[PDB]
Design a protein around this ligand. Sequence first.
Ligand code: FDP
Ligand code: FDP
Ligand code: FDP
Lengths: 496, 498, 496, 498
Amino acid sequence: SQLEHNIGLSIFEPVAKHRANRIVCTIGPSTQSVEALKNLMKSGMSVARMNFSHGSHEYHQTTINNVRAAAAELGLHIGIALDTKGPEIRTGLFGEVSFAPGDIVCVTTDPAYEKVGTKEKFYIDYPQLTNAVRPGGSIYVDDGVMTLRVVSKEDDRTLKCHVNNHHRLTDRRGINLPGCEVDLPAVSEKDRKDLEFGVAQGVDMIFASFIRTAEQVREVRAALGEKGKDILIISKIENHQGVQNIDSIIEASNGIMVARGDLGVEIPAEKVCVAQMCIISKCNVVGKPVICATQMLESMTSNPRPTRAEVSDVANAVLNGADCVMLSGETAKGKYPNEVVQYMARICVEAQSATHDTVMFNSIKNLQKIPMCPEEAVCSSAVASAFEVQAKAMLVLSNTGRSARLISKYRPNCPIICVTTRLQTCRQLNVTRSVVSVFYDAAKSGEDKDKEKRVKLGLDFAKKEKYASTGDVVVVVHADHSVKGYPNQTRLIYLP
Amino acid sequence: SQLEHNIGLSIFEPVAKHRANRIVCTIGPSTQSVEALKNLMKSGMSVARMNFSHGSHEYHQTTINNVRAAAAELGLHIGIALDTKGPEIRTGLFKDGEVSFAPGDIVCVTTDPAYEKVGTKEKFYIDYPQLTNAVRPGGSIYVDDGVMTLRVVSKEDDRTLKCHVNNHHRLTDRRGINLPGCEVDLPAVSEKDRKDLEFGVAQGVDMIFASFIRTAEQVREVRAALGEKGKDILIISKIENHQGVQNIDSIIEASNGIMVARGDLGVEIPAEKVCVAQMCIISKCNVVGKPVICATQMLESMTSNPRPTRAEVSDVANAVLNGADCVMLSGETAKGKYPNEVVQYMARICVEAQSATHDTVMFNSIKNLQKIPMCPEEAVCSSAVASAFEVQAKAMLVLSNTGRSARLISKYRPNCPIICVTTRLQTCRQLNVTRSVVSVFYDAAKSGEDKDKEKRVKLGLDFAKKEKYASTGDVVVVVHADHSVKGYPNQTRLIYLP
Amino acid sequence: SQLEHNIGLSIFEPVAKHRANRIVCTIGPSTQSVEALKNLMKSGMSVARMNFSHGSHEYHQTTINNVRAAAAELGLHIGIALDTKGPEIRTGLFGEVSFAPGDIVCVTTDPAYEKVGTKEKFYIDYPQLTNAVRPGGSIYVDDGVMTLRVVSKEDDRTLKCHVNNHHRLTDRRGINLPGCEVDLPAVSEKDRKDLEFGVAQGVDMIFASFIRTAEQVREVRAALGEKGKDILIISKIENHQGVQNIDSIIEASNGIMVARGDLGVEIPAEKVCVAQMCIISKCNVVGKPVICATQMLESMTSNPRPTRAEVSDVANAVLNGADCVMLSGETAKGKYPNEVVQYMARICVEAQSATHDTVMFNSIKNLQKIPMCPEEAVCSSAVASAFEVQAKAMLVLSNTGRSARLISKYRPNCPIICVTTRLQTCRQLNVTRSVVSVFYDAAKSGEDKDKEKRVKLGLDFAKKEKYASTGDVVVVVHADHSVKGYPNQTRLIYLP
Amino acid sequence: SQLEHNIGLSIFEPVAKHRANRIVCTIGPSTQSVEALKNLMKSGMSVARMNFSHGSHEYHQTTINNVRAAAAELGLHIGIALDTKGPEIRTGLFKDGEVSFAPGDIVCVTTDPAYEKVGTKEKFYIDYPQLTNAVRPGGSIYVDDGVMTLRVVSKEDDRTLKCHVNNHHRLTDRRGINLPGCEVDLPAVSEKDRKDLEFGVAQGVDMIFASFIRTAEQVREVRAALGEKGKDILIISKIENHQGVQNIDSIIEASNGIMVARGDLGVEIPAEKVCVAQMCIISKCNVVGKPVICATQMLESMTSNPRPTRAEVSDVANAVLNGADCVMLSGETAKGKYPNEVVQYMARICVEAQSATHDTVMFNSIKNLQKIPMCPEEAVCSSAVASAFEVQAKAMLVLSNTGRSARLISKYRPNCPIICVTTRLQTCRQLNVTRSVVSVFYDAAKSGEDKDKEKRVKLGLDFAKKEKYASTGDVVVVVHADHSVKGYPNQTRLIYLP
Ligand SMILES: O=P(O)(O)OC[C@H]1O[C@@](CO)(OP(=O)(O)O)[C@@H](O)[C@@H]1O
Ligand SMILES: O=P(O)(O)OC[C@H]1O[C@@](CO)(OP(=O)(O)O)[C@@H](O)[C@@H]1O
Ligand SMILES: O=P(O)(O)OC[C@H]1O[C@@](CO)(OP(=O)(O)O)[C@@H](O)[C@@H]1O
């Protein structure tokens, strides 16, 4: 039981030597230089997030170039993620006002009130407004620091609203419709240009904002088009629809972000913790990477030490089952970008060492539909045989990354060394728990039909990184001599 | 499995009507007035914490009087907790009242009290005579809440360590010292604690939060300090350093309860190791059935902001999921801008984590670790909770004079309120640290002996009905003694509310 | 796990002192005298079975009188069971023949062939014959020592049959239709007279032969009528229909007999073991007594020692979960009636001591629909609290026996002392595992509204029978001072 | 749970096509002819047992030759087992060749060999010199297969016990003696066993069923007796008395397998305690992965009747449910009227009990009791069986030269056939005592080295197809070594049948 595992926990035992979970950092002024990036990588960054809410194509190009130069200097494969600005609902032009508690205000969707507007009749660029918010429900303004409650519908396009608290305003502020189905495009026009940038520049994954339906995930894929077919889509769940539609969004995506900042505006703050637990477990169950985001070490934007709550939050995201934990402002524009990543890495390792070896393995395995595909039977059994011999490492050949993700899904307690023939697989596997990638250049080194070259490369990597030594058993997953497309074989071998 | 339970969780379902977990609030200038305290109680405060690190007896008397007046007007039973300063290690003074250190700086620290008032950048005093025994070369000394770190380089003599400063810091008079990973032979109770404890006993406080408990032997010395007049006051031991964590079993045995004092603990042990200690300490309390409080920075940002961070919301939820009876607020309510709002948030998060808890998993896990044979009252209490799950009881009702039997039922983590009918007002107040329990006072002076339990049972069932725990025709599980057994409950009944 | 429980088993540990399972014996010439019966009771008999297949009303009256006198001498409550002859299918008159392997024969249902018949055209008194057995299936003759396979339908009422083996014949022999729905009456005319005898003489239960449907169980109850409303009906499952309809037969009956002798003729012999396991567990799950019958110690009809298979069979019926095990020929007409019952009792105790304490409790509890009725919550929790304190006995007040059966359903490891106000409850509880009955005569002793007299009677019985001593905890189940109709209260008390 | 599994059982469902359990038959005048033996093999005999309690070497040679000829004509691999007489305790002779005892009779028994040929009602010989040490006053001596019982009353001298006869019995020359609950210091092997063992080794028998094993030390003495030429012959130890049961762990360690010899055991220990020993011994073999045979009277009534009793059917089913690899027939096939029919019945009951078994419960239970870390081949074998369950494999295929790896897979109780491709005919024959296994012989003399395993794998997959275990496009789990590892299998593959 969890309870019996807990009472056996000790703060005096050595922690795991090899960190399983993965850290995503947002880049910004704190961290854009090649030097800052290198330190960030030494500190524990596996994925660089470009927040496309702000900055131009030129700014983000500097980010891209600088990441790639930092990584080449350190001999690392660092994934690069494009986080889209996303379709959004905003007020029209004004140039300011002030709305102290108790006021009564009118919001219009007629586009002749866009450039005009005042304390009494201002624009909202969402043209379906008087559908979504029926009388009695709420309109959130500016990440919901200000709440408005609609009484009724004035003309076809205006609603009447009782203001609830203090606040100032300015043009083009952010609007939320909490608990309301929102019928926006998956992809804004700015998003189209940003995605096609991302394709052209070869980003590894897209963090797709405000994903509400499976259909919107497919819109994002079609926009990536043919040249972008192998770019991961990580759907950001940000409102009640996302949560409602989670099953089918998962099916459509390569992975999920629990985008708690935005989600905690759209749904009551205390319900985010139910959503988190639910979503992370649903992803664990299908073997798709999941990322926990937002304010995880927030106070380290300004302090050299995190709060007790913040350490807890990181530990528990790991215990919940998240592959990755993310940093936003902490690394983008904080005083202590390196220290915050180092803390995050230590907390990960600690939560990982407190995790019961085999509980996830069994739980996940018991929820799988029988019969399995052969490769999944091979990968789950390989993880079982890793526990059985206390393997210090596993080794998988994977070109797309599929097989690595499939092993990671069963949650072994050792590193998964993935020898791959694709640089982009090395980068994309950065969002998958446990996996460590080694590139085999098949053009340079030859075909390796019998797998011996890649196996040797992987076993030598295990020695060099001090995962294992001579005479240690390693579990090795790839195809036999004739099967193509997936691994059908496991071997236990002793390092020479 | 947890994993299967998670995938079935819903944000769309109604949440539990009755909050199981309890909230301890620290009182300060934000919240000390009668009016502020009524608001706090309405928002969900069950225990008022006084931090005796600060403030005179007069300040705290006002807190006590105000809490009592507020609770009287509302008809609530509210616990009052006295949190001791506890013994301390501190530097001496510095010349000019301050001195600045940079990395690489070598400084001698001495336990020779000659140097107490004349600290410099070269040499300063630390008031712990066992210093040169406690930290060897290589070991660390933490200054000013760990903000500054010293590596001990060598022992110069039997009272002097040569140290290396690890980082930039400005140091003022009499800063706190922490000796990570060292035993520490301070008394259980300082001279000041005695005057505060005596004050506590005189004013009739319900519990001590005893600072810096490292051994069971110190818990007993706190009990001895409270004397005969304080024999009934709960001792909740604060676990604050590596020793406390290492001796947790015997400290639990000796205490009435535990507080995981995360702020201090995370200065003594690496910050990341606090989550491991929390999970362990909380579970070990659950297993023996003693209340445990989780403390420190749980909603810290709401000291200034009307909304908590995402980290802070999950912290509260996860403390409840770990199994904590209580969650605590410190500066959030002592000194903060939004003391009502933060208690309201804490209460909402509590209810949400409770509703996301698998109903029977704790019950089973806790039951499976008990030694067999149980004493009869524990077999009675655990089997009552089992019966409650089996009929989906909306409430349980237990007669308890000391609180023992209420705490014993709560140990098994029912998913419904536990209505306790008690003959002691102090039990009413002290059950505020116990999950699920709701107290009703039976006045035996007014109403008579109640040997056959009928009046107390009627009072409880009326309470359940009035307070909307249950309605006519609902099954309620009722635990007390039969007509002859004395000293503990040997009987369980299932009863339809009349 | 079962496997881990097994490897811990020891043949050197003391066995349980108090036998939980119950033994039914068939009476006959070996065992009809008052003396023989007394020894049989001393040996371990809890229920006397009168086999109404043979013997007259007068013969069985002697059995009844003699049982009641033996029991009164020993101060015991012995249940008396009437096992009905049952509707049956038989051939017509002949006066004999012989059918060595390979022969070809014709069977008719025209009743003008009843008194006549020979090697070539003999009667079968089941008039729906050419419906049930379609060409290709089989007709069993004389407990299926002889099998016949039908080729086709000659005239409306005749079938043509290929004989399969040697055998002789005589008038009025037993016929089975293996795998065929058989549309007979639940109650034969002989059965009506026998049941009304049973009512008049006050038998405790009816072992109802050849029960195929719930509806037939109700026919048996209606025949018992008003004066017999409280007589247990134990339905004997004897063919594939019984097995198919088991759920609804269980619902209708007070209990079940797995009538393996008859069942092993109707269905393939090896399938009886699947049926046994299934039926016994279904009864355990609803808390209704079940009896395993037929050939359990067969060879002890003639030998003073059982075979290894026979000892195994008894042990495993107990391990399967059966309340009772039965003896037929072994006690009715064997040389060693006392020894066979003594063996059976020792095997029961051994299997009981090898049973894991709490596995049944949990298994049964986990299959119950939540919410439970209050009395069932009380009874299951009382058994849980018995395990928790290692109670040496439980004590229940029960007038109908309902509450005793409900405690027994949760399978405690100690005796269940039942204080009852009805002599017939004492007798009927003989088919329920663990239960030991004490009669409280309320007319003689008074009302006992506060339960103290019956509780004292039960606690004194616990002392006298050496279940418990002064200072032992006992779990005591009855109503509180105001509730009527069921127990709502449990207490743990120390024997004074 | 078992209980939930039971309630879902159906008599109407199709049963498994391939029998997992194996059947050992004793050969006698009913079954010795080539023709009788072909019929027996077609009916399901996998191992032919010779009972060396009776019969000359010539009789048994005929059995061996006939078994081999029958199996050759059918193309079957059939194990041959030699069951030793074993050492014995017996009475001496009586005057007039007999003597009758009644209850209450006092009789002296002596270990003085002077009395060996002149037993009377007053005094007779028992050929066990340690008698007066082994049974104290109060203890029992069992005569003539326990049919007669003596209570030892007193010790008259160092070679004479005064006894009380418990029951009526007529006693003839040289009846068997059993000393219930006493250690018994007979040799592992009698002088006769040596000539039988030597005969066994010369004729190339596949296994010994070694009688009356009480200690691991005796198992080793049987192995030493078989010498170098018999180093490869399986020793299946017969557990026959309390010692055997008490030392089962070390006897298991020393043996290749166990037979629960219920007939003899139930003379030594109370008859009811045999079910407890059976369940324990069978499970302990399952846990270490050594074959276990259940024996004695399993279908006894079919010695004379064409149909078994209800007890006998459940006995076979329950031995299979306990976990026995094999079930045995003795007189049923040696001396009986219906030797084919009884084997056919045994086989049908086996298949029914197998189909009623929960597929994965054994796998899990067995796996959870293994020490971690496993050796790599056991991790390979148990994980292969896991993969078989996960894809609902219709067969597994394993390369094994000694049988070790086949037995290691069988240990984990897959629900499908385990096809073993072996390079030794003797392994083919010896795998007949192992659940699920079906052997194919690869002739390395004819067909070559097969270093890369491809020929042996093809032979196995062809076998699976020909024998209707699986068809084209079915997944099959395949276990052997990779191209470099020697001595054990380090590799598992899932392969679609071509
Ligand atoms: O790229 P994924 O989809 O993970 O499949 C990789 C697997 O396919 C195989 C066989 O096709 O790759 P490879 O051909 O490169 O040797 C396996 O060896 C390898 O484990
Ligand atoms: O006869 P059953 O149906 O078991 O009900 C008996 C129960 O009812 C009660 C209460 O009605 O009987 P009683 O009135 O005889 O005292 C309980 O005390 C007793 O446990
Ligand atoms: O005879 P056992 O002990 O089963 O060992 C057989 C195993 O060893 C190996 C390797 O040595 O045999 P082989 O050399 O005959 O190919 C594996 O292929 C095979 O599975």
